[PDB]
Design a binder for this molecule. Structure first.
Ligand SMILES: O=C(O)COc1ccc(Sc2cc(C#CCN3CCOCC3)nc(C#Cc3ccc(C(F)(F)F)cc3)c2)c2c1CCC2
Length: 244
């Protein structure tokens, strides 16, 4: 039942995202190739030009590129939950369009540690203090994501926890302009029932983790709100996914 539902969604995750958290930690701690460090202008330039052969404006462009693949991954992850696919086009568009941002940040925690973040599907590691050395308000906008992720990562979540968690962020009954509110509220309810089951089996002694995770969702929301607001003060394939 609920053990098997957790597992079904764990599969669509593994099948739809290339950088699992396991893969991430594997590289950061170096199992068996070591990421190219970017700590300054020289190394950033090498990572763009070649290792052998404005600056605020380039780090930020690179943050936006990542997103293109991430959204594609989410849309598929999403569409691979059968309940999601049984929803009407208008509902599916609304759910991805409001969810993706929270999810994109929830997942970012996977590739982030105290010292920096993995880049170029795993082959580069840009350092936190290089990122802090950028002019405002560009560094104003990257820091609150590092702060969220370090907090987030302290919760010891693993891919199978994350899979449900992302399912919960997308399938969310509060999104503005949903047509079938009660249907979305029912599915989440299930995704939530099972998240809770999962956590209390897979984190037997972390006893306030679920209500902690719920706070993280509220927290993520606020983090997007502010991200939208900060971006304002700065620049001043298939049918459905071409829409989100
Ligand atoms: O355009 C905007 O919205 C503003 O810029 C952003 C746009 C998007 C983001 S999120 C993000 C996500 C991800 C990711 C990922 C991978 N995952 C998806 C699959 O599962 C595992 C995790 N990476 C980044 C980034 C970055 C980055 C930062 C710096 C550089 C540099 F090294 F300078 F070139 C290169 C890349 C940002 C962020 C920012 C600033 C803060 C974080």
């Amino acid at each position: 039942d609920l053990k098997a539902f957790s597992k079904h969604i764990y599969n669509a995750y593994l099948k739809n995202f290339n950088m699992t958290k396991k893969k991430a930690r594997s590289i950061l701690t170096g199992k068996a190739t070591a990421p190219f460090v970017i700590h300054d202008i020289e190394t950033l330039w090498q990572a763009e030009k070649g290792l052998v052969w404005e600056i605020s404006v380039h780090v930020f462009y690179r943050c936006q590129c990542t997103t293109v693949e991430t959204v594609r991954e989410l849309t598929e992850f999403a569409k691979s939950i059968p309940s999601f696919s049984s929803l009407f086009l208008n509902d599916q568009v609304t759910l991805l369009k409001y969810g993706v941002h929270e999810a994109i940040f929830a997942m970012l925690a996977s590739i982030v540690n105290k010292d920096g973040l993995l880049v170029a599907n795993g082959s580069g590691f840009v350092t936190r203090e290089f990122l802090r050395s950028l002019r405002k308000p560009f560094s104003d906008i990257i820091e609150p994501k590092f702060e969220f992720a370090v907090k987030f990562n302290a919760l010891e979540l693993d891919d199978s926890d994350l899979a449900l968690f992302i399912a919960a962020i997308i399938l969310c009954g509060d999104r503005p302009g949903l047509m079938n509110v009660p249907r979305v509220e029912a599915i989440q309810d299930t995704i939530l029932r099972a998240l809770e089951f999962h956590l209390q089996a897979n984190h037997p002694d972390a006893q306030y983790l679920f209500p902690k995770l719920l706070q993280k969702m509220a927290d993520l929301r606020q983090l997007v709100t502010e991200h939208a607001q900060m971006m304002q003060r700065i620049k001043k394939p298939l049918l459905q996914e071409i829409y989100k």
